[PDB]
Amino acid sequence: YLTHQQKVLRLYKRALRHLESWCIHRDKYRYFACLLRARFDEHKNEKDMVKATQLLREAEEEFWHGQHPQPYIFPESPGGTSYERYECYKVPEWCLDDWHPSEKAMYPDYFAKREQWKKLRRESWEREVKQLQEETPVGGPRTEALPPARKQGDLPPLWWHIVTRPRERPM
Amino acid sequence: KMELPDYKQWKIEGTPLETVQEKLAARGLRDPWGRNEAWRYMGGFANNVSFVGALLKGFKWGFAAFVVAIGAEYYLESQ
Amino acid sequence: ITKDMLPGPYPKTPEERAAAAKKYNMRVEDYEPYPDDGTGYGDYPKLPDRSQQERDPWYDWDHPDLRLNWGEPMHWDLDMYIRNRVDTSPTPVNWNLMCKHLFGFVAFMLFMFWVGETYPAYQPVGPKQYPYNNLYLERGGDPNKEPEPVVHYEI
Amino acid sequence: GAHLARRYLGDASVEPDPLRMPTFPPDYGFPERKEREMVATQQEMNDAQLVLQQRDYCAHYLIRFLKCKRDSFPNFLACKHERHDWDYCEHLDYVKRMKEFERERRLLQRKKRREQREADM
Amino acid sequence: PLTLEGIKDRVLYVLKLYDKIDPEKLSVNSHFMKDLGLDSLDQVEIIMAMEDEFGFEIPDIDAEKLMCPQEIVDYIADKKDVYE
Amino acid sequence: SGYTPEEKLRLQQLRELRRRWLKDQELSPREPVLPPVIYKTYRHSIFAFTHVLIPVWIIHYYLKYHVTTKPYTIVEKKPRIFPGDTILETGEVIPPMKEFPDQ
Amino acid sequence: SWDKDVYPEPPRRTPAPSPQTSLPNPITYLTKAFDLLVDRPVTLVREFIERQHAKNKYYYYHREFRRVPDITECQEKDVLCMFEAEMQWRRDYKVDQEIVNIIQERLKACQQREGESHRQNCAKELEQFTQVVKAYQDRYHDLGAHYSARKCLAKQKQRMLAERKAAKEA
Amino acid sequence: AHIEPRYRQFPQLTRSQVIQAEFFSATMWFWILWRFWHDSDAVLGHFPYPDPSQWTDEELGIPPDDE
Amino acid sequence: VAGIFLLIRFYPLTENNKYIQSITLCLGAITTLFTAMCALTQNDIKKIIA
Amino acid sequence: MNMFSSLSLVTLLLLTMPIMMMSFNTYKPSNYPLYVKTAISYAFITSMIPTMMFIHSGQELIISNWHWLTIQTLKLSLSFKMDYFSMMFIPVALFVTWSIM
Amino acid sequence: FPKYEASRLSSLPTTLDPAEYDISSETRKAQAERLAIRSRLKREYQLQYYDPSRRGVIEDPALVRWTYARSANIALFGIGPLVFWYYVFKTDRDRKEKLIQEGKLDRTFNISY
Amino acid sequence: KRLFIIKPSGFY
Amino acid sequence: DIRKMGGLFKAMPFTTTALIVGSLALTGMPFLTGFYSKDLIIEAANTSYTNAWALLMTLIATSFTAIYSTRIIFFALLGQPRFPTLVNINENNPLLINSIKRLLIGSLFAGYIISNNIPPTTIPQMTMPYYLKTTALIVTILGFILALEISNMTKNLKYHYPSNAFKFSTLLGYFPTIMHRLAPYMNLSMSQKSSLLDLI
Ligand SMILES: CCCCCCCCCCCCO[C@@H]1O[C@H](CO)[C@@H](O[C@H]2O[C@H](CO)[C@@H](O)[C@H](O)[C@H]2O)[C@H](O)[C@H]1O
Ligand SMILES: CCCCCCCCCCCCO[C@@H]1O[C@H](CO)[C@@H](O[C@H]2O[C@H](CO)[C@@H](O)[C@H](O)[C@H]2O)[C@H](O)[C@H]1O
């Protein structure tokens, strides 16, 4: 699934981040990040892909030996301290349909504009289905990529749940 | 809305990033990101205390207040 | 759902395997049932014994919390492999070495505690002395029975 | 722990055993040995509700200190002198236990020094 | 409170502090490889610099697609729900 | 590596919709349309009255007339008595201790 | 309030205040505030309620159960006599449970009251607790959930037989 | 708000937070020095510790070797 | 602190039981050393204080 | 005894009042957190009076105010122990909780 | 670098998997066929998930198949453990009953049971 | 500026 | 993550002061609140009839307390900043200052005030050799000196491989890694799971 170039670049990013977790201090990190870059540049032009694969394989074993047992993780990345912290506050938009009319009356302007989005979704749906139908090979899609809208006044197929997803800090 | 400081004032000269650059130059290498770290070694961040300096925070006036207290306590009791 | 889309008995022939693989939305070269026996797996696929914590967290799963896609075959023990439970992720230290170091540490501490119990520390003092026959009455001694005298001397 | 090295690494036969001390008679080597005087009566310690482990030969100073504290409330810095008097008595009580350990130690070495010669004869 | 112009200014600020880029040729639409002449190893370092700048991770699958400053600004705005 | 032209266009069209949606999450000025030192001493005076005085009245009444009228419901540790004390109930004088030697 | 003989207390001995400081005791002034602001208004409310109770005074009594023949005097399978004997035994069983509770409450109150001197000063309560528990155990312990006067009697006769045999061998 | 964020620069401080911080740091050191001046025995020792090797055989009741 | 407080409540029993004294002594000693050793390399500020 | 026992219980009762008000809808949601923080601070004050009484004379008592259940020869009462450990710990816990809130 | 030893609860990292780098062309073909199945199911799900008029649950046959298989078929389960505990408890209670009969078990204050 | 908070209906 | 802190000694003066006071109280600095309990506890343990191994483990842990207390101060407060570029450092809320301030006053004086008001219930041991009286203060001081050496070595331009003792400490002795996988696995497969006698 990953190409050789993709695997090399992912190792390079991964090794730098673990190197950064060992060094801590910026001047120390900058110094050793340059040595590491030099090692990658030492074989950038290796044309023999059999040798190149072995270099990649050996670099991965070297990384496994020298990885930080407790590397730095950005707080909201998977495994971070703030990961998924705000999922409890994310409420799907369809819940507003079940509001009592008295609750809806407190935001007359918000719910007026909400009807314009629901109307837009209703009048776009048939085109989106028919566009996907006529752009999909006989044996169904071969990838998960979706197409853009082709005409003016058309919306890209399957847009609602991307466009109206909850905000990252919804409360 | 927010005015960033001019980017040309970030220089590695006079900072431990300069020392790193000399060591790298010895091996023919060079650091292309040094100015991106320079703000951490400049301005109000330039001179932090040492650990013993941190533990002694407030010792100067704490001592001065102490010397007065034990001079006052002598005079109160001596009389 | 109909009856031909439900799990069935263990697949006998290659034709049944092809049908089973198709029912489970699997590629026939990937489909493999549990070995026939009395457990009762039937033709349910045997899938890799891996935790859901091992799946890519950045991919756009239909069920992000479970890291599952709609329609894909669920591991037999998925409820055990949810992210709240059993983790099979690779570890920076080999499993067997981790066990040796953990066990060795606890085994060493237990030995030393027993040694420390056999050679206790103490100060060079004699027993603490108490008056009135070692506080015979205060400790609930029988008032009517006479205690043996406990005499302490100066030094 | 200096004595602990001697007992565990050297000869344990001439070291005191803290769980069985004393093993020589109290008057042995002491011609006429005085008894220990207790100032506080059993009733006084009972009414003062002293903790049993506190009902030792220093309890009269503790009672004096405890009364001072109750009387000096809310001045919780008072009774320093009463506290020291009780503390100093407990130090004298502890020094006597140190002497008992040393007396036991020297009597055991004296025992060996005897047993060597009688062994030699 | 990030703004679209605020994100753009900080993205360009970081690149103007990168010694492999001429600060006068740089623009929001410059292609890192076809305009500024950098390689794919350089682009990885740029993404890491942006991750440090804004304090969040850009996964390798998305990161490899960000080949100009505007695409980085757009990616960050989409993740932070910045619309103005 | 990089967005294909079809990928760029789809991303652009979704970001335009997404930004329009986020703008529409802003409340208008009238929303929500809702239906129909001396201060400090008074706040703390009313709080103390309703949260300290009233409960202590109830608890004291409950303890005095319902709990302490039953045996062994409230049991004090008896007061410590020291040499030289005077007992209120009987007027007894507790004798002092013997003479302390010296130290 | 309650029978002082059933729930005895010793005579309280409080020591008179003997200050040795010039500072005022904050407890003394808080006691005056508590008496004025808390106890006094509370007492007035009770005295009002006590006046109303006096206007309407009525009585309730403690039920007295006549003794009836016990299970030893019941002919085998004579349910009418066994019923009265069995209901009586159950009433006494509930009374003995409360007698042990009274003695346990004496022991617990003594331990708290005597403070650090409780091991010596609570001997009599402890000894009385030990005896009543022994007697209660002999009567009722090991009878099972379906206990009855019949099973209680069978247990007693077993104990009496072991006591007679032990004396016989003595 | 009252404090405005800064880019790549030392943050803005108020006089109150600095003064209070200095006051309580100085209070800590006054308290330590004051207590040590009056209660140095709590740190270094309350009473002398005797040397048992200096106690005479007469005061420990050790009879001579010929008894 | 509830665990410690429970044992403090029951000191009138534990003070007469040398066996329980030894067990709680060794259990506390391995706890204090082992968890202080763990804190020496933690990077999360909250886990260090934990 | 009456001041000591009465104030030992108001401290605990005082802490349950914000819970009562919330569970019966009779409070101001605008600043419930301030209301809870104020209740803790007053509970600390009232708890310092029994503690002062104990520090003075070592006054200890047990309050067995409600007979809940009796199982044959086991009587279970709601019983509170105002002793050395309760008198010293409660003000400390309340003072610290006051800062945390 | 000592080799990685995989375990049941500690699996081999992908970057250390020798099969990860030795991609053939029939392995590429298998990967392309797996993605086709995933994409086909993704489309089927999305055409229902995005339908404006759908209100309910998108029934998943995979989930129904899993629960159906898991609920079918109605040493820790046989007589082994029952026998083991029987001899543990019977032995304990025989010893206790013997002591009580000989008057050697302390039940001084035991009157609740 | 104030943003609408999407919540489940609290009325019932 | 403390590795992304640094240079906060002046940017957060009040949090700094409270952090230093709390660290000194925790490490048993004389006459701060922590000293009035820990100092007596170490002397009580030193002079008791006690397990010798347990006593030694307790003193080493006291030394280790100085080390991780130093580690927080060194990486959180000292050095150059390592946090992101947009500086939103602000500790000037009255609720924050006042809450910490009261606990700061408690952390200085509470031990002294409590120590002098509680009635004595034991015979405190006050006679001991100098090396048992000052053991806590010494090993605490040694832990601080060693902690400085270790922390300052993180600045040298040397990259080190991890030792096995370092991995043991970082991964908490592998107790969670081994026990939180194995024990759940055994129990969870216990039920969802041959003897001929039963087959009859
Ligand atoms: C203050 C606390 C004081 C007490 C400290 C107690 C520490 C006790 C540690 C005991 C555990 C040591 O456990 C031991 O570790 C070493 C380290 O490689 C292992 O050593 C062995 O395994 C490795 C890896 O497989 C191989 O290179 C080789 O076979 C050998 O070196 C041993 O197989 C193991 O038995
Ligand atoms: C019974 C007595 C109890 C103890 C009483 C102790 C009271 C002592 C009060 C001291 C008050 C000092 O007040 C504080 O002093 C420090 C001195 O570095 C000043 O700080 C000063 O040095 C630092 C740099 O090192 C900078 O902030 C600046 O150069 C200057 O302000 C603070 O601006 C001032 O707010």
DSSP codes, M59-121: HHHHHHHHHHHHHHHHHHHSSS--S-SEE------HHHHHHHHHHHHHHHHHHHHHHTTSPP-
Q: Which residues of B touch E17 (CB under 8 A)?
A: 7, 10, 33, 35-36
Q: With DSSP H G I counted as helix, E B as strand and the rest as coil, what are the percentages for chain L, rounded to 5?
A: 0, 10, 90
Which of G117, G119, G121 should one mutate to test binding to chain D, selecting the residue with the greatest count of D CBs within 10 A?
A: G117
CA torsion, ordered B20, B22, B27, B29, to nearest 10 deg: 70
Note whether H46 and M126 are within 8 A (CB). yes
Q: Which atom of ligand 2 is nearest to the CA of H15?
A: 35
Give a three-class secondary structure readout of C110-152.
HHHHHHHHHCCECCCCCCCCCHHHHHCCCCCCCCCCCCCCCCC
Q: CA nearest E52: which of A74, A137, A3, A111? A: A74
> How many Cβ pairs closer than 8 A exist between chain E and M?
6
For ligand 1, say whether the CB of C113 is within 6 Å of any of its atoms: no
Interchain pair M84, E54: CB under 8 A: yes
Distance CA M124, CA K93 (A): 48
Enumerate residues 6+ apart whose C-beta is below 8 A from J73: G97, G100, G101, G104, G136, K111, K112
For ligand 1, say whether the CB of C97 is within 6 Å of any of its atoms: yes
Chain D residue with minimum CA distance to H50: D95
Neighbours of E30 (CB within 10 A): 19
Amino acid identity at B20 = V
Amino acid identity at H46 = H
Distance CA J76, CA J68 (A): 6
Could you give the strand order of the β-sheet that contains J74-82, starting from the edge strand earlier in sequence? F74-76, J61-71, J74-82
Chain G residue with minimum CA distance to C138: G120
Distance CA A155, CA A160 (A): 10
Residues of B with CB under 8 A from a CB of H: 2, 4-5, 10, 39, 43-45, 57-63, 65-66, 69-70
Angle formed at CA C72 by CA C7 and CA A10, multiple of 5 degrees: 150
Enumerate residues 6+ apart whose C-beta is below 8 A from G95: none
- Beta strand spans in chain A (E): none
> How many Cβ pairs closer than 8 A exist between chain D and M?
30
Neighbours of C94 (CB within 10 A): 17
Which of D21, D92, D94, D101 should one mutate to test binding to chain M, selecting the residue with the greatest count of M CBs within 10 A?
A: D94
Q: What is the resolution of this structure in A?
A: 2.3
Considering only CA atoms, give the Rg of chain J. Answer: 16
Chain E residue with minimum CA distance to C56: E59
- The interface residues of chain H toward chain C in range 24-63, judged by CB-CB distance below 8 A, are 52, 60-61
What 3-state class would DSSP assign to C35?
coil
What 3-state class would DSSP assign to D97?
helix
Residues of G with CB under 8 A from a CB of D: 18-21, 23, 25-27, 115-117, 119-121
For ligand 2, say whether the CB of B64 is within 6 Å of any of its atoms: no
Note whether I36 and M71 are within 8 A (CB). no
C-alpha distance from M138 to closest chain C C-alpha (Å): 20
Q: Which residues of C touch D99 (CB under 8 A)?
A: 126, 155
Helix (H) or strand (E) holding H38: helix H15-39
Give a three-class secondary structure readout of K46-73.
HHHHCCCCCCCCCCCHHHHHHHHHHHCC
> Which residue has 């070692």 as its token pair?
C134
Report the nearest-CA residue for atom 26 of ligand 2.
Answer: H18
Interchain pair M106, J55: CB under 8 A: no
Would you please indicate which residues of E are annotated as catalytic (active-site) residues?
A: 39
Chain H residue with minimum CA distance to B60: H26
Taking the alpha carbons of B31, B33, B36, B40 in that order, is the dihedral positive or negative? Answer: negative
**What does the DSSP 8-state code read for residue C5?**
G
* Inter-helix orientation angle G149-169/G79-113, to 10°: 70
Interchain pair L4, A100: CB under 8 A: no
| Ligand 1 centre distance from Cα of residue C101 (Å) | 6
For ligand 1, say whether the CB of C22 is within 6 Å of any of its atoms: no
Establish if K76 touches chain M: CB-CB under 8 angstroms. Answer: yes
Interchain pair M52, C102: CB under 8 A: no
Distance CA E52, CA B36 (A): 11
Note whether I20 and I14 are within 8 A (CB). yes
C-alpha distance from A40 to closest chain B C-alpha (Å): 13
C-alpha distance from M11 to closest chain I C-alpha (Å): 18
| Ligand 2 centre distance from Cα of residue M127 (Å) | 41
Note whether G112 and F75 are within 8 A (CB). yes
Q: Which residues of I touch J60 (CB under 8 A)?
A: none
For ligand 2, say whether the CB of H23 is within 6 Å of any of its atoms: yes
Establish if B30 touches chain A: CB-CB under 8 angstroms. Answer: yes
DSSP string, M128-189: --HHHHSHHHHHHHHHHHHHHHHHHHTTSS---PPPHHHHHHHTGGGHHHHHHHHHHHHHHH
Report the nearest-CA residue for atom 32 of ligand 2.
Answer: H19
Cα A73 to chain center, whole Å? Answer: 16
Solved how?
A: cryo-EM
For ligand 2, say whether the CB of H26 is within 6 Å of any of its atoms: yes
Helix (H) or strand (E) holding F76: strand F74-76
For ligand 1, say whether the CB of C108 is within 6 Å of any of its atoms: yes
Report the nearest-CA residue for atom 23 of ligand 1.
Answer: C97
Note whether B16 and A27 are within 8 A (CB). yes
Cα K23 to chain center, whole Å? Answer: 33
Q: Which chains are adjacent to chain H, needing at least 3 Cβ pairs under 8 Å?
A: B, C, D, M
Note whether A1 and K31 are within 8 A (CB). yes
Distance CA K19, CA K13 (A): 11
Note whether M30 and H38 are within 8 A (CB). no
